[PDB]
Design a protein around this ligand. Structure first.
Ligand SMILES: Nc1ncnc2c1ncn2[C@@H]1O[C@H](COP(=O)(O)OP(=O)(O)O)[C@@H](O)[C@H]1O
Ligand SMILES: Nc1ncnc2c1ncn2[C@@H]1O[C@H](COP(=O)(O)OP(=O)(O)O)[C@@H](O)[C@H]1O
Ligand SMILES: Nc1ncnc2c1ncn2[C@@H]1O[C@H](COP(=O)(O)OP(=O)(O)O)[C@@H](O)[C@H]1O
Ligand SMILES: Nc1ncnc2c1ncn2[C@@H]1O[C@H](COP(=O)(O)OP(=O)(O)O)[C@@H](O)[C@H]1O
Lengths: 461, 408
C-alpha cells in the first residue's frame, strides 16, 4: 500500500480505527452506491451534488458500512482509497512524468485487487488520465467512485460520450433543515468532546435555521457545522453554547446586528424604526408598516425613494438591498430578459438572481412580464434560468387650462400609497430665520444642494 | 530536529524577534482558527510587506508570554529529498507540541502566508478543505507610526543614531503619499533605515528634513516639495503661467479645490486640466472619451480618495489674448528656426491676420495650428530650400493687402 499511501488515505482503515465521523440520514445514497458498485461492467458511481452537501460523507459512510460487514458479498473486505489527481500531476514537468505515476498506481491496484478508488473532482480527469483509464473502466476491472457538481459533470464528463458512458450518476441532494438538525445532533458528541464545551439542541436548531436563511452561497450541512465549530472555538479562546453565541458568530461573519439575529416582536417596531430614518408622511409609513406586518412578499405603488431605502434598511439587508430600475429609457428586451440566444446582449433578472432578498424599485413607470411576476412570483430570462420574487418587495413610482395601467395590473398590487416638516428636514440633513430661508430656498431634492452651496461652502472658508 | 527549520518560540524567548504591536485582532483570529475542529489551519492573506510574518511573530511572543489559550501555551512554533521531509514529519507527529509555520506556502496543524494573487493561483481544491484564509489588512498612517515608535529603539541601537517622533510622522506620511507602489509598514521602515544609514555614512540625530531628502533622492522629487495649504496658495500663479485667458475660471477652480476629492463639470478646458495635474501632482492625468490606471493621485478628464474628477460638455418675425495664443503657437517654429540659426519675427498685422484666418469662435483655437502650418511653415520651408533665406538671417513676416504674407 506504499504506492497508494503516498497519494491518498485508506478510508476503510480510518473507519476501522474509528477516525471517520458518523453519517446520518444517508442510507439511500449509500445503498444506491452499493448497487452501482455491484454491477459487472461500468460499475463506477459518480456522486453529483453541490459542494459541501456530503458526497465525501457518503463515501465515508460506505467505508463504515464495509467495516461493519453489512455490504454485499462483492464489497466485503474492499479497501477504499482516496486519490487526488492534483498530487499525481503536481511536480510533473517532462514528457512522461505523470504517466509514470499513474501507471504505477494502476499496477499497484491490479496487484492488490481489492482496492476501490474515490476520485474527488472527477471532472479534472479529462494521452492523459482519461485515455489511460478508459480501456479499464469499460470492462469493470477498476472500480472508481467520482465526486463532482452538476454543472462540472455536465460540461466536462457528459460531453465526452466515451467517458460519459463509463460513469453512473448518483444524485446527492442538499440536506433539509430537519436533516441538517439531525446530522448536527449526530455530530454533537464529537464536537463537545473536542471543544470541551456543551451544546444545547436550541443552539443547533438556531445554527441550522440561521445559516439556511442568511448564508446564501454555502450549503446547509457544511455551513451549520462551520457555525457550531466557530462558536466552540470562540468559547475556547475565552462553559456552554447557546443560540445567542451562534447569533453573535453569524453577525460577525455577515454584517448584521447581533440583537436582530437573536419576529413578531421585532416586526412590531416597524414604525418606530422607520421614523428614525425618515420623517413626515406619517400616514404612508403607517400604511406600509401595517401592510408588511400582516403579511411576492409585497407590492406597492408610490419620500418615495427615501421611504423605499428606509424600508429596505429595516427589512432584509441595508440600504444596498434596494435595486433601482429606470423605466424611462425603455419607452426594451434588455431589461426583461436581455436577448434571445444568438443576438446581441445574450452574454450579459440580472440583479434579482444574485440578490433574492431585495426591494425592487421602478422609477417613472413589458407589462406582461410584470404581470407574470406579480401573479406567480417568478420569471425566466433569456438564458433559461428562473429568477424568483417570492420574498422580494416591489415598489412602483409615478408622477388649470381654461378660465377660472391595465385593470389586472392595478388589482394585483397589494396596496397603493400616496411647513414644520421642512423645518425638521433641514436640521435632519445638517437659527430660526436661517432655517426658514434654507427651507424656502430648497423647498416649495434641491435642498441638499442649496445647503452645500451656502452653509458648508461659507463655513469651509 | 530543528536542522530543517528555525524555532520561532526559542528566538522570541531569547528576544531576537522584533516586537509587533497593533495586530491583536489578527493574532486572535489566527488562534481561533487554530482552535477549530475543521479547517484548523489558518493561511494569512495580504499584500507584500503588510506584516504577514509579523502576526506569526506576535503569536510566538504571545505563546512564550502565555497569553494564548491552554491548548497552545505548551506548543513551540517551527518555521520550515522526500526521505528527509518524511523523517521530519514523523518527528513532528511523534512530538506533537509544534505548529509548523510555512512562509510563502504557495511554493509547497500549520500556518501559511501568501499574497491574495498567489493564494488564488496556487491554493484556491484539496488544500481548501484544510486551510482557512485570514485577512491581514494594510496598516494606516497611525498604525505605521506606532510600529515605527516600537522599532525606534532597535534601529537607533543598530545605526547608533537618534530618531525623533516628528521624523516618524514625516516618514509615515511621506511614504504613504509618494511611495504608493510599496505598502506602508515596510516602506516607512525602509525610509527610516535608509536615513539612519545616511547618517552613519556621514560620520547623531535624524529629523524630518533628512527623511524628506532621502525620499527626494529615491524618487527625484525636489526636497522643497516634500518638506513644504502652502501647495494651494500658489495655484493661481502656477496656473496662469500656462493658460492664456480664462482667468475667472482659473480663480474659481483654484478656490473650489482649495476648499476641498473635488469634482468639476472648446478653449482652455484640456489645457486647464493639464496645468492642474502638473501643478498638484507633477506630470502633464488621464483622458477618456480605467480602474487599473487610477488604482496604480491623478486628474481624470472626460468628454479614488485622492483622485480629481473633471467633466466637460425663433421661427419667424422675431426682432422688435488671441495674439498671445498665436505667439505661443509660433514659439515652436521660432525655436526650430533658432536651432537652424534663424530668428523669426512676426508683425502685429501678420499676427492679426493669422488670428483672423485660423481662429474659429465656434471651435475656438482648434484650427489655428493648421492655419499657421499652411501660411508660415510651408512658405518658410519652401524659401529655405530655395536658399533665399540663409542661416544667421532674421526672417521677418509681414502682411500686404484677400491679403497675403511676405518674408524678408
Ligand atoms: N449526511 C451527513 N452526515 C454526517 N455528517 C455530514 C453529513 N453531511 C455533511 N456532513 C459534514 O458536513 C461537511 C460536508 O462536506 P462534503 O460534502 O463532504 O465535501 P464535498 O464538497 O466534497 O462533498 C463535511 O464536513 C461533513 O463531515
Ligand atoms: N433634497 C433631498 N436629498 C436627499 N434626500 C431627501 C431630500 N429631501 C428629502 N429627502 C428625504 O425625503 C423625506 C421627505 O419626503 P420628500 O422628499 O418630500 O418626498 P415627496 O416630495 O414625494 O413628498 C425626508 O424624510 C428626507 O429624508
Ligand atoms: N505590526 C508590525 N509590527 C512590527 N513590525 C512590523 C509590523 N508589520 C510589519 N512590520 C514590518 O514588516 C517587515 C516585513 O515583514 P512581513 O510583512 O511579515 O514580510 P512579508 O509580508 O513579505 O511576508 C518587517 O521588516 C517588519 O518589521
Ligand atoms: N475645450 C478645449 N480646451 C483646450 N483644447 C481643446 C479643447 N477642446 C478641444 N481641444 C483640442 O485641443 C486643441 C486645441 O488646443 P489649444 O486651443 O491650442 O489650447 P489653448 O486654447 O489653451 O491655447 C485642438 O486640437 C482641440 O481640438
Amino acid at each position: 500500500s506504499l504506492v497508494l499511501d503516498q497519494f491518498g488515505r485508506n478510508l476503510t482503515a480510518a473507519a476501522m480505527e474509528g477516525k471517520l465521523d458518523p453519517v446520518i440520514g444517508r442510507e439511500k445514497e449509500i445503498e444506491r452506491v452499493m448497487q452501482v458498485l455491484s454491477r459487472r461492467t461500468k460499475n463506477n458511481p459518480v456522486l453529483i451534488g453541490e459542494p459541501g452537501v456530503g458526497k465525501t460523507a457518503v463515501v465515508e459512510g460506505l467505508a463504515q458500512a464495509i467495516v461493519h460487514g453489512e455490504v454485499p458479498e462483492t464489497l466485503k473486505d474492499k479497501q477504499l482509497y482516496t486519490l487526488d489527481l492534483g498530487s499525481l500531476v503536481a511536480g510533473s514537468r517532462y514528457r512522461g512524468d505523470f504517466e509514470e505515476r499513474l501507471k504505477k498506481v494502476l499496477k499497484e491496484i491490479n496487484t492488490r485487487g481489492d482496492i476501490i478508488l474515490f476520485i474527488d473532482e472527477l471532472h479534472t480527469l479529462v494521452i492523459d488520465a482519461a485515455s489511460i483509464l478508459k480501456p479499464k473502466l469499460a470492462r469493470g476491472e477498476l472500480q472508481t467512485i467520482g465526486a463532482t457538481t452538476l454543472d462540472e459533470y455536465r460540461k466536462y464528463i457528459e460531453k465526452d460520450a466515451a467517458l460519459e458512458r463509463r460513469f453512473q450518476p448518483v444524485q446527492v441532494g442538499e440536506p433539509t433543515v430537519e436533516h441538517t438538525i439531525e446530522i448536527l445532533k449526530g455530530l454533537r458528541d464529537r464536537y463537545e468532546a473536542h471543544h470541551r464545551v456543551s451544546i444545547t439542541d436550541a443552539a443547533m436548531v438556531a445554527a441550522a435555521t440561521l445559516a439556511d436563511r442568511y448564508i446564501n452561497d454555502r450549503f446547509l450541512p457544511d455551513k451549520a457545522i462551520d457555525l457550531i465549530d466557530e462558536a466552540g472555538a470562540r468559547m475556547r479562546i475565552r462553559a456552554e453554547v447557546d443560540d445567542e453565541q451562534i447569533a453573535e458568530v453569524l453577525g460577525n461573519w455577515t454584517g448584521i446586528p447581533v440583537f436582530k439575529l437573536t419576529e413578531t416582536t421585532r416586526l412590531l417596531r416597524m414604525e418606530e424604526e422607520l421614523h428614525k430614518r425618515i420623517i413626515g408622511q406619517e400616514d404612508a409609513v403607517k400604511a406600509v408598516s401595517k401592510a408588511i406586518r400582516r403579511t411576492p412578499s409585497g407590492s406597492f405603488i408610490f419620500g418615495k425613494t427615501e421611504l423605499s431605502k428606509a424600508l429596505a434598511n429595516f427589512l432584509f439587508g441595508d440600504d444596498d438591498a434596494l435595486i433601482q430600475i429606470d423605466m424611462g429609457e425603455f419607452h426594451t428586451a434588455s431589461r426583461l430578459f436581455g436577448a434571445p440566444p444568438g443576438y446581441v446582449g445574450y452574454e450579459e433578472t440580472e440583479k434579482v438572481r444574485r440578490k433574492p432578498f431585495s426591494v425592487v424599485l421602478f422609477d417613472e413607470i413589458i407589462y406582461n412580464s410584470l404581470l407574470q411576476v406579480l401573479e406567480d412570483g417568478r420569471l425566466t430570462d433569456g438564458q433559461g434560468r428562473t429568477v424568483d420574487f417570492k420574498n422580494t418587495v416591489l415598489i412602483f413610482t409615478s408622477n388649470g387650462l381654461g378660465f377660472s395601467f391595465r385593470p389586472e395590473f392595478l388589482n394585483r398590487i397589494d396596496d397603493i400609497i400616496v411647513r414644520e416638516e421642512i423645518i425638521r428636514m433641514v436640521d435632519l440633513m445638517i437659527t430660526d430665520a436661517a432655517k426658514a430661508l434654507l427651507a424656502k430656498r430648497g423647498f416649495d431634492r434641491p435642498l441638499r444642494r442649496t445647503i452645500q452651496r451656502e452653509i458648508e461652502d461659507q463655513l469651509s472658508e
